[PDB]
Amino acid sequence: QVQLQQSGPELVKLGASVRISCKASGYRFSYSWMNWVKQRPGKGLEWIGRIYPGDGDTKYSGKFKGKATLTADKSSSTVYMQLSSLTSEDSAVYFCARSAYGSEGFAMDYWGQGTSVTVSSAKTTAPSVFPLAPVCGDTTGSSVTLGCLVKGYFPEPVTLTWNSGSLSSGVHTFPAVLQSGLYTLSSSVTVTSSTWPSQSITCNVAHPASSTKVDKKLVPRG
């Protein structure tokens, strides 16, 4: 049961440093290379470097030599990566991944969930979460679509759920859009006409940067 648990999302300023962690379990920690991969928004995968926690041996991509510093702690089974002299280019999601043996092509077989890192001079802004109830001129119909607007927040990410996750079918959560320094996303949920408002529907929005978890119940207009 190999599992790689990465640290939470970060917001740091230009020229500063950041250090993210990757806690490993399910295998002998000190005898498998740990890699780090960069993925900027909408871009491809980019290999940074890898470390062997047994003896601290490290190998860096030429492009990241001097910016990335990999360390490993055997007591906590945790691998770290530090990025220095941060720029906007360094804003991205960073993954950790364990490499396999040579007979397996040194393939990165287990990955962490990724850590979002935003490098910017702007500060955190909690989202405004607005429920979107339908208009009166829909006749309800065979189905009904409900909305949830998450406006004016920074930085990424946010996690949006419906009915605390129990309502997952018929959901469309849209990618966040940046505008004037703030993000906005939306989510729609489609259900049977007789489901709502007889059955309660509520969207939940979590914004780790501001440590907020907001619930907004969908009530008909009127």
Partner: protein
């Protein structure tokens, strides 16, 4: 570094058909009877997933319809039959050199029958209005093909400033696309217009797809 170049950059395949991706390495990836070339699959929001290792070996829980092959400097990934849940980005990756590298990635998507969008428009919420803002939201869900144009009409005049559009990646179950368009005004300007209209053009309809509401 050993450079990996993939072809094509993007690909659309019908269900049940074969998808073929290629990966070309500037140097030999083999060493001692092993090809140090791996394939990864990444779906939106998720970390990459090991798909093929050592060129031709199935990853943990990877069905046989994914097939890797090749040696030296030329490798290829075949997916047959393509299934709905296989829309994703596929990368090749090499561990031969001291520094490891990824290919540029290949976006593979599904082709399916045309599907009309379900359009829904929402006026500003009571909570936003009381706060001094006013956003109008329009959802256009589960349509195909992805080509679609959306305009906002306020009392007949098109509004472009203040519009924020967002598109989902292809649905991994029904292979459709969805779009969300948000029009943001001040509460003051929202109060001095009557009809707000979400208008879309899509090949599944000969006329504009219209959802609107009239104040007052």
């Amino acid at each position: 570094d050993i450079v990996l170049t993939q072809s094509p950059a993007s690909l659309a395949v019908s269900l049940g058909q074969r998808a073929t991706i290629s990966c070309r390495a500037s140097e030999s990836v083999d060493n001692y009877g092993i090809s140090f070339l791996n394939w990864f699959q990444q779906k939106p929001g998720q970390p990459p997933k090991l798909l093929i290792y050592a060129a031709s070996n199935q990853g943990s829980g990877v069905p046989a319809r994914f097939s890797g092959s090749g040696s030296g400097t030329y490798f290829s990934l075949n997916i047959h039959p393509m299934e709905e849940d296989d829309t994703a980005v596929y990368f090749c990756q090499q561990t031969k050199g001291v520094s490891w590298t990824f290919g540029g990635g290949t976006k593979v998507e599904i082709k399916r029958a045309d599907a009309a969008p379900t359009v829904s428009v929402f006026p500003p919420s009571s909570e936003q209005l009381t706060s001094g803002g006013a956003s109008v939201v329009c959802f256009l869900n589960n349509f195909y093909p992805r080509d679609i144009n959306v305009k906002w009409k306020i009392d007949g005049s098109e509004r472009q400033n203040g519009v924020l559009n967002s598109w989902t990646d292809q649905d991994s179950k029904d292979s459709t696309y969805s779009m969300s368009s948000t029009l943001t005004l001040t509460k003051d300007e929202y109060e001095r217009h009557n009809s707000y209209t979400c208008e879309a053009t899509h090949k599944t309809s000969t006329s504009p797809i219209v959802k609107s509401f009239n104040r007052g």
